[PDB]
Design a protein around this nucleic acid. Structure first.
Ligand code: MG
Ligand code: NA
Length: 350
DNA sequence: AAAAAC
DNA sequence: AAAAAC
DNA sequence: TTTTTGG
């Protein structure tokens, strides 16, 4: 029997139903842009269960017993089996509101609100936006346009590994005992990604040392002419669990990666890097949260509430019946507390 | 406000 | 048919 | 959009 929760499935990078999940991913993106939460969530769950399957869907009998697939999803599956394409998703791909949303949000610093504001102002290309004498861009959007070609072209495992070394070298200069862990998609065994995420924690660090680290590291890169963009968000952490973002201290950077650190034109590459500074006692929760994937986390939180009367987030796990916070030194302990079998990072690609 | 994250 | 999906 | 409706 296949579970409706991504956290009770193994989802590797081997997808047998990519023609189906591409269509569902487009329809989900279309409902996410039109804000429609309900439909959007059902398509992501459908697309997610299909990625977990150890076989391709060739007939409608192949959908029997698979959760998450209702009358609409089955109609899209039946459409792809017949013509080999989705008329529903092809419609969305030719739709100007989607093309424009996909294009505008692809800029670093432009989200759903700016993309819609621009689409309603009659804009359809990034060229017309930059040429427009009236528009005023945020320091973030100015960075996003200035390094667009570098950011829109995915980062790879040699580059991510070159960034990891660079991050580690900067951190251990200020905190020798610091543990730096590459999270996100790369930790899930991905070959490519848009950014490289990191989790920094230090057992021997003082409270002042934890707060001043991201400033010490970013100014160090600024002095070396490597910092292209920087935004440090201060910690709001305590801790009341609620039914988003993390309260950990973090920063969103664009780093200059010299080609000589990887194995040309510029001699460097603009790379989007996220650094998350977390207290040592909360490290497993932060590592479980920043590893992802989005759907895996959503289902970990969903399973915890609905099947266990527990509240999980990036900071802690709370048992609602025992009225106590559950302590964990590893991701394996969080899974244990939840009553789940451990899922390896490269099996969380839901 | 809006954006940045899995 | 109506509602909640954390 | 899917699921649940006294499961
Ligand atoms: Mg990432
Ligand atoms: Na964006």
């Amino acid at each position: 029997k296949i579970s409706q929760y991504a956290c009770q499935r193994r989802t590797t990078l081997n997808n047998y139903n990519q023609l189906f999940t591409d269509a569902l991913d487009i329809l989900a993106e279309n409902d996410e842009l039109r804000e429609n939460e309900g439909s959007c969530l059902a398509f992501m769950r459908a697309s997610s269960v299909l990625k977990s399957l150890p076989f391709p869907i060739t007939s409608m009998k192949d959908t029997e017993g698979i959760p998450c697939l209702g009358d609409k999803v089955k109609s899209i599956i039946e459409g792809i089996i017949e013509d080999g394409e989705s008329s529903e998703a092809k419609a969305v791909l030719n739709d100007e509101r989607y093309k424009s949303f996909k294009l505008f949000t692809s800029v670093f610093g432009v989200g759903l609100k700016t993309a819609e504001k621009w689409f309603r102002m009659g804009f359809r290309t990034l060229s017309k936006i930059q040429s427009d004498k009236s528009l005023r861009f945020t320091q973030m959007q100015k960075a996003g346009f200035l390094y667009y070609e570098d950011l829109v072209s995915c980062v790879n495992r040699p580059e991510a590994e070159a960034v990891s070394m660079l991050v580690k070298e900067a951190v251990v200069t200020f905190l020798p005992d610091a543990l730096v862990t590459m999270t996100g998609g790369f930790r899930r065994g991905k070959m490519t990604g848009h950014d490289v995420d990191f989790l920094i924690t230090s057992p021997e660090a003082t409270e002042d040392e934890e707060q001043q680290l991201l400033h010490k590291v970013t100014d160090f890169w600024k002095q070396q002419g490597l910092l292209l963009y920087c935004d440090i968000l201060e910690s709001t952490f305590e801790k009341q669990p609620s039914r988003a973002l993390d309260h950990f201290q973090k920063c969103f950077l664009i780093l200059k990666l010299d080609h000589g650190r990887v194995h040309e034109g510029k001699g460097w590459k603009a790379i989007r890097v996220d650094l998350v500074m977390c207290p040592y006692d909360r490290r497993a929760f932060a590592l479980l949260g920043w590893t992802g994937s989005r759907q895996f986390e959503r289902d970990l939180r969903r399973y915890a509430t609905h099947e266990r009367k527990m509240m999980l987030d990036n900071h802690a796990l709370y048992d609602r019946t025992k009225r106590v916070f559950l302590e964990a030194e590893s991701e394996e302990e969080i899974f244990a507390h939840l009553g789940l079998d451990y899922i390896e990072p490269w099996e969380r690609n839901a």
